[PDB]
Amino acid sequence: AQNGKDLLIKLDLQFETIAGLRATRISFNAETVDVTSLESQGGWRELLGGAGVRSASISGAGVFKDADTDERARQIFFDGEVPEFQVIIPDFGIVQGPFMITSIDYAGSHNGEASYELAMASAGALSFTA
Amino acid sequence: AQNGKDLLIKLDLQFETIAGLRATRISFNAETVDVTSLESQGGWRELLGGAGVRSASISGAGVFKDADTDERARQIFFDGEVPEFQVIIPDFGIVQGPFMITSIDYAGSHNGEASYELAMASAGALSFTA
Amino acid sequence: AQNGKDLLIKLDLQFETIAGLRATRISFNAETVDVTSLESQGGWRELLGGAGVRSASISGAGVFKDADTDERARQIFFDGEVPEFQVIIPDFGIVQGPFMITSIDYAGSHNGEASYELAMASAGALSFTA
Amino acid sequence: AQNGKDLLIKLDLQFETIAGLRATRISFNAETVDVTSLESQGGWRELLGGAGVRSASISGAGVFKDADTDERARQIFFDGEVPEFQVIIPDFGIVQGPFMITSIDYAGSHNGEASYELAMASAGALSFTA
Amino acid sequence: AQNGKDLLIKLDLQFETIAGLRATRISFNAETVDVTSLESQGGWRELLGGAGVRSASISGAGVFKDADTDERARQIFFDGEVPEFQVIIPDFGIVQGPFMITSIDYAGSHNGEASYELAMASAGALSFTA
Amino acid sequence: AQNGKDLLIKLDLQFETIAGLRATRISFNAETVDVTSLESQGGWRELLGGAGVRSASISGAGVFKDADTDERARQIFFDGEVPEFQVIIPDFGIVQGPFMITSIDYAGSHNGEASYELAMASAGALSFTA
Amino acid sequence: AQNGKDLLIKLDLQFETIAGLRATRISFNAETVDVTSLESQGGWRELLGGAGVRSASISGAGVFKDADTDERARQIFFDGEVPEFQVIIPDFGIVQGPFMITSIDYAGSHNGEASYELAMASAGALSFTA
Amino acid sequence: AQNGKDLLIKLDLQFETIAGLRATRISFNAETVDVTSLESQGGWRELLGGAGVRSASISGAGVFKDADTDERARQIFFDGEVPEFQVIIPDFGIVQGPFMITSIDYAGSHNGEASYELAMASAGALSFTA
Amino acid sequence: AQNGKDLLIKLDLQFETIAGLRATRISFNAETVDVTSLESQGGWRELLGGAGVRSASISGAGVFKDADTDERARQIFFDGEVPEFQVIIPDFGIVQGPFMITSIDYAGSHNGEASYELAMASAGALSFTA
Amino acid sequence: AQNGKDLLIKLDLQFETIAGLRATRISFNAETVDVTSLESQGGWRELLGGAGVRSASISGAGVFKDADTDERARQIFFDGEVPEFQVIIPDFGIVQGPFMITSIDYAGSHNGEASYELAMASAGALSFTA
Amino acid sequence: AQNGKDLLIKLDLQFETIAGLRATRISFNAETVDVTSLESQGGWRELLGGAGVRSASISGAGVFKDADTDERARQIFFDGEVPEFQVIIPDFGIVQGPFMITSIDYAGSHNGEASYELAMASAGALSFTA
Amino acid sequence: AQNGKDLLIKLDLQFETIAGLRATRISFNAETVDVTSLESQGGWRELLGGAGVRSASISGAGVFKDADTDERARQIFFDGEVPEFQVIIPDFGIVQGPFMITSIDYAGSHNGEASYELAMASAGALSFTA
């Protein structure tokens, strides 16, 4: 078993995690390049595999606590960059990829928090430190 | 931690917040300009970053209490303008952007409130007061 | 605070509200005419504002109680018209717009009510009585 | 107030209601033919009204009890017809329209009923008996 | 009233029902061939009726109990056929149609069942035994 | 009845199941090649059957426990391959198909687990060991 | 605003509109007799105006409903005539011109309508009733 | 309204319709013999009418189902003939004309049908049975 | 930024804009008098510039609302003239040119508007008021 | 109904189909030798039929998988030949004609496949095996 | 990667970019002087290369914002000149060529912008600053 | 199956691929020298084959990333040459042909990339390395 407190996204400025990090989710994708020739041993769909583009997307939720890493993401959004982002998996290790800052949003209610979602997507080739 | 009562959207007339402000949510976006060349170190999707357009959208919910700032939004909708709007983040600071008044709606039930949603979207370059 | 019992939609025949008016919701819109030139001080999306078309939509729910104003809406639907409709906001005032009768529906169950939704949309220039 | 037990859909064979009629819902529509000229007193969307096509759709839910009117709907579906259907509104009156039998479905579980939905849509000009 | 235990889908091999048959739902359709001429007594939408194609779709849920009829559906999927399928309605009778085996799926959790959905769609002309 | 603990997806490296396997679901498909000629004994939709392409998709959920089979899936994603995957059905048997690693995602919260979804899709002709 | 249901093409037999009149379009033309002398105050193209021939073309779409006016157009095509045709503009008035029946076509699909296009062109001097 | 399933093209061998008849379209033409004399009451284009040649063209789409009428069209193409073809209009009646077999084409994909277009054109004087 | 509602075409009778002016587009041209001598510093195409004729074309779309300026264009077409037309550019100013009325067309559907396109082209020397 | 997987083009080396055969389309033609004498019973166009030349064209799309039959087509193109090609129709049979290799093209993107179109045209007399 | 905001066309008056520059596209050409002698090692087409004339064309789209550089282009069009134009490529550099102002057009709708296309073509020898 | 990332066009300076190579497409041609004698066993068109000229054309799309191979193509265009170009097919091999640089174009928008198309055509005899 691995603690959900362990997997951490973190910005550059040298890497530090953001403050409100209530729920985060790295999500990989591939578009499944269908190569269905007429011949196929039972009429099954055949796929190519390595031809497909592959992606990554980070969706971080949290409560707005002011930190320099939280101010950094605003500066990354206004001065639109694609810097290095890094996401630990507990016992796998970090990812250390270039991402962008696709859509952030700050929210607040009459009774609750200052909360924020932070949605990111892949911008380059990723890595894995094991 | 930051109070959700602190983050406030506010209209011009000089800036004042609207009356019913039950739930508000600034939401930023970028469309992620995919630049996927054939070469890529693992077949990963590459992204450009700064080429993407970037946006902002404000969705304010609340209960209809008559105020001059609430009458102002009706006047902003009928006389269709794109004036300056300003949204505080508690410990970040204000945003102070030009937005429009994309879709508002007033609602009422047989037993409940006069309530309203107020949806806005970015109309120009934004700012950040830190 | 404003009572939800106060905001009232009403038909012409001289204006009277409909009988079952369980939940009603005027909803305004604008399509946000994106004017994103290549220059923009941080790559922000620029918007025009007043070029966008603007709309209104009324969605009234209620229980079927037979009234002349309820029979009027059937006559407005079969003899397809775009007459004047009027929606009070409690302390703002009325709207007094031409709408159509886009989609109505009557519903009933084996144990419950004769209920109805009544969906309307804008058909002309609106107003505001303050 | 009007009882939901009163509003009844009914088939021809002379008109009789179907057996399982747990929840029924006549739903009218119009597609809102947008006539937005460049001139409009506040940039408001203008609509034409009577040019729009208008429709009706009936969605009847119920439990499968075998009746001749329930067998009739199967015969209406296989021998695809558009016969007269009639829906009472409690204190308005009947509708008496030609509809078709667009999609029906029979369902059953390991513990529950033989249930069915019955979805209909308008096929001609409707009426109103007042 | 009719028991939901009575309506049964069944495969050929001679007809036998499948093992896990937790929830099943035959669903018929017609695409409603709109024939809206300019003339129509109130501007109502006119429909043709019998010109529309008509369909059937079976969605069977259940828990994976190994049976020869359950192995048959796998053989129907890999050796892609359109054999005769038969669905009883309690007091109507059977349907006895040619269907295909459009999408099946087996599912299991760390604590629950081996469960399966089985989605079918019409492949030919149907029948009704009364 | 069959235990949901029995149906197991498993990777190659020789086959071993992945660690967090909270909910898994193989899902087959066929696109239903509509062959609707003008003649049809009641206007019913006719289908061809075996002409349709057929597919399979695996959606595995689980909690991130570090295993070599869990590291293998990351290596399968970065070095984009289409290796053999194998899914037991309790009393049917295995499937043993070539799949790809379409989209994986790691997620964690401030209080919960390191969890992951693992979505796969068919890449070749499948099998069945009975 | 003017309803598109109002503008109507109509045949002689005394004038009656055709049955399927889904989309109709009178289209006028002039060939723009270029009179470009060497002198012209900025090298602009000069045109003569009234020397150009002027035309009209009617393209009527619709669904084949059998009417005597629909049979008339077939008789106008086989017995090739140039009779009087008349097209209302809603608030302008009629045109009342001699046209021919240049190209008609009947079409039908395996699932849709019997539809037809009807293309006409000017054959004489036109009129305008105001 | 008339069903699109009703209008049918059919070959001789005695007349039978072809198998795949997904979309068919008889299309008539006339070349509009322009008789524009210098005099014309407003400079309008004058046309003669009956001097123009008149034609017919049939474009039939469909899915290749083997029938004797489908084999007949291949025999009509290789042994190039101009036999009698017959096209029903629902409530008008048949046409019964001599056509040729101008261009046919068979098509198939890796996943779809064996489909075919069949393009014909007029070869003689046509008829009309009313 | 400039509003698209500001640029207006207008007829003489003193100048007034037409009613339906949904989309308008002044379009200038020059035919690019190629003067390619054998000598050219890299074999580049040389052009003369001022020798080319220059043109203007106006294409106005809109919905038929009856106005005196809309009746004027019909009178300009039948009594073929080349009067003064004037097109504002928002912050540039007017054009005030002689144009003709090259091709207009009125269109209407079974459900939509009475719409019209209005195509114009240059007839003389143009101007610019700044 | 016939599967689109069944119709197959195939080269000589003895006949084998090519690898990527995503979409293929044999297309026949005849140029319609117009024999329009002055006499014709309604002024109809008369055609001769068998005098017209007749052709065939094959357009095969697919993904580049290296096969000896795929290398053969390159050798057929560089060493320009007109060998025998053979195209099955599912239930008709083969064609077995001499064709040439008119235009092939290989294509690839930064993210997609190595794909190819293969366009062929008739080079001799064709056949039909029934 | 290079930002599309970086490549800029600019006029002389000293060089400044135009205001609305939504989409711009320099396009070079050469007419490919075919020199196909009878001898050629496989019957391949031989080309000469440097004999071909070479060109450039600029197509700039944008929204009409009044600027002196936007007024300049009108003055360049009416007083027909071929002045120096300059187009940056992000990391290549400028072009700095003499062009003409071939065709401009201003457009506006009832709801949208004042927009303009600006089409240019080469008029002399070009350059490259690296 | 073959990856579209594998097929690569490349310039000489020794061969290196260009930077932005988003979509590339080698396209071969032959003009089909029609040799249709009066005799032909069914009136079929006869073709000669090897007499036809044969060609190749390369259309490369991509995003402008500055490289020496990208600067080379500009130098190949201005100093008009016909150097050796080389295009890999994944499992076939290279082509290694002399081409010219027929038409290139650089494009950029207000929000997107600096993109470019690069169109080439054959200039000599080609090859194939297998």
PDB file of C-alpha atoms in Angstrom, chain B residues 52-56 64-67 70-71 74 77-78 80 82 100 102-110 112-114 122-126, chain C residues 1-5 7 22-30 32 36 41-50 54 89-92 127-128:
ATOM      1  CA  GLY B  52      -1.427  29.134 -26.989  1.00  0.00           C
ATOM      2  CA  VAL B  53      -4.122  31.718 -26.425  1.00  0.00           C
ATOM      3  CA  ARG B  54      -5.005  32.191 -22.789  1.00  0.00           C
ATOM      4  CA  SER B  55      -8.326  33.040 -21.231  1.00  0.00           C
ATOM      5  CA  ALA B  56     -10.233  33.654 -18.029  1.00  0.00           C
ATOM      6  CA  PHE B  64     -30.656  38.577  -5.729  1.00  0.00           C
ATOM      7  CA  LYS B  65     -30.236  41.425  -3.284  1.00  0.00           C
ATOM      8  CA  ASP B  66     -30.863  44.751  -4.999  1.00  0.00           C
ATOM      9  CA  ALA B  67     -27.740  46.882  -5.098  1.00  0.00           C
ATOM     10  CA  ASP B  70     -26.334  44.557  -9.169  1.00  0.00           C
ATOM     11  CA  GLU B  71     -28.204  47.083 -11.296  1.00  0.00           C
ATOM     12  CA  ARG B  74     -27.949  44.639 -15.961  1.00  0.00           C
ATOM     13  CA  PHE B  77     -25.648  43.551 -20.240  1.00  0.00           C
ATOM     14  CA  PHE B  78     -28.227  45.648 -22.073  1.00  0.00           C
ATOM     15  CA  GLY B  80     -23.247  45.683 -24.007  1.00  0.00           C
ATOM     16  CA  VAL B  82     -16.540  45.166 -21.779  1.00  0.00           C
ATOM     17  CA  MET B 100     -17.803  40.784 -20.602  1.00  0.00           C
ATOM     18  CA  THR B 102     -21.577  36.672 -21.269  1.00  0.00           C
ATOM     19  CA  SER B 103     -24.672  35.169 -19.681  1.00  0.00           C
ATOM     20  CA  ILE B 104     -26.622  36.111 -16.577  1.00  0.00           C
ATOM     21  CA  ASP B 105     -29.819  34.522 -15.354  1.00  0.00           C
ATOM     22  CA  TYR B 106     -32.292  35.258 -12.591  1.00  0.00           C
ATOM     23  CA  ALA B 107     -34.159  32.405 -10.969  1.00  0.00           C
ATOM     24  CA  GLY B 108     -36.818  31.976  -8.336  1.00  0.00           C
ATOM     25  CA  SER B 109     -38.952  29.201  -6.957  1.00  0.00           C
ATOM     26  CA  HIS B 110     -42.274  28.912  -5.176  1.00  0.00           C
ATOM     27  CA  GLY B 112     -36.870  29.670  -2.191  1.00  0.00           C
ATOM     28  CA  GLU B 113     -34.885  32.743  -3.080  1.00  0.00           C
ATOM     29  CA  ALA B 114     -34.492  35.102  -5.926  1.00  0.00           C
ATOM     30  CA  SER B 122     -12.077  37.312 -20.447  1.00  0.00           C
ATOM     31  CA  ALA B 123     -12.096  40.193 -22.889  1.00  0.00           C
ATOM     32  CA  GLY B 124      -8.549  41.505 -22.791  1.00  0.00           C
ATOM     33  CA  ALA B 125      -5.175  41.351 -21.139  1.00  0.00           C
ATOM     34  CA  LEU B 126      -5.291  40.674 -17.424  1.00  0.00           C
TER      35      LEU B 126
ATOM     36  CA  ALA C   1     -32.223  39.208   0.792  1.00  0.00           C
ATOM     37  CA  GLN C   2     -35.071  38.738  -1.674  1.00  0.00           C
ATOM     38  CA  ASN C   3     -37.877  36.203  -1.630  1.00  0.00           C
ATOM     39  CA  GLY C   4     -37.991  33.732  -4.501  1.00  0.00           C
ATOM     40  CA  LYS C   5     -41.759  34.086  -4.392  1.00  0.00           C
ATOM     41  CA  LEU C   7     -39.789  37.021  -9.145  1.00  0.00           C
ATOM     42  CA  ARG C  22     -42.582  26.127  -8.972  1.00  0.00           C
ATOM     43  CA  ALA C  23     -39.202  27.153 -10.343  1.00  0.00           C
ATOM     44  CA  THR C  24     -38.409  29.808 -12.902  1.00  0.00           C
ATOM     45  CA  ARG C  25     -35.122  31.005 -14.306  1.00  0.00           C
ATOM     46  CA  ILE C  26     -34.420  33.807 -16.749  1.00  0.00           C
ATOM     47  CA  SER C  27     -31.028  33.172 -18.328  1.00  0.00           C
ATOM     48  CA  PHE C  28     -29.069  35.661 -20.414  1.00  0.00           C
ATOM     49  CA  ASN C  29     -26.237  34.840 -22.799  1.00  0.00           C
ATOM     50  CA  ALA C  30     -23.597  36.292 -25.077  1.00  0.00           C
ATOM     51  CA  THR C  32     -18.139  36.062 -26.649  1.00  0.00           C
ATOM     52  CA  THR C  36      -7.454  37.410 -30.615  1.00  0.00           C
ATOM     53  CA  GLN C  41       0.635  41.875 -23.793  1.00  0.00           C
ATOM     54  CA  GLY C  42       1.042  38.402 -22.300  1.00  0.00           C
ATOM     55  CA  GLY C  43      -0.509  36.285 -25.006  1.00  0.00           C
ATOM     56  CA  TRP C  44      -3.882  36.843 -23.363  1.00  0.00           C
ATOM     57  CA  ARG C  45      -7.112  36.339 -25.228  1.00  0.00           C
ATOM     58  CA  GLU C  46      -8.656  39.645 -26.272  1.00  0.00           C
ATOM     59  CA  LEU C  47     -12.424  40.002 -26.705  1.00  0.00           C
ATOM     60  CA  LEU C  48     -14.507  42.629 -28.454  1.00  0.00           C
ATOM     61  CA  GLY C  49     -17.548  42.856 -26.215  1.00  0.00           C
ATOM     62  CA  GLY C  50     -20.397  44.734 -27.854  1.00  0.00           C
ATOM     63  CA  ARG C  54     -27.193  38.704 -26.644  1.00  0.00           C
ATOM     64  CA  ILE C  89     -36.869  40.706 -10.596  1.00  0.00           C
ATOM     65  CA  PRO C  90     -37.866  41.532  -6.901  1.00  0.00           C
ATOM     66  CA  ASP C  91     -36.098  44.844  -6.442  1.00  0.00           C
ATOM     67  CA  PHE C  92     -34.758  45.421  -9.941  1.00  0.00           C
ATOM     68  CA  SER C 127     -36.217  46.190 -21.484  1.00  0.00           C
ATOM     69  CA  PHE C 128     -35.821  47.071 -17.815  1.00  0.00           C
TER      70      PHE C 128
END
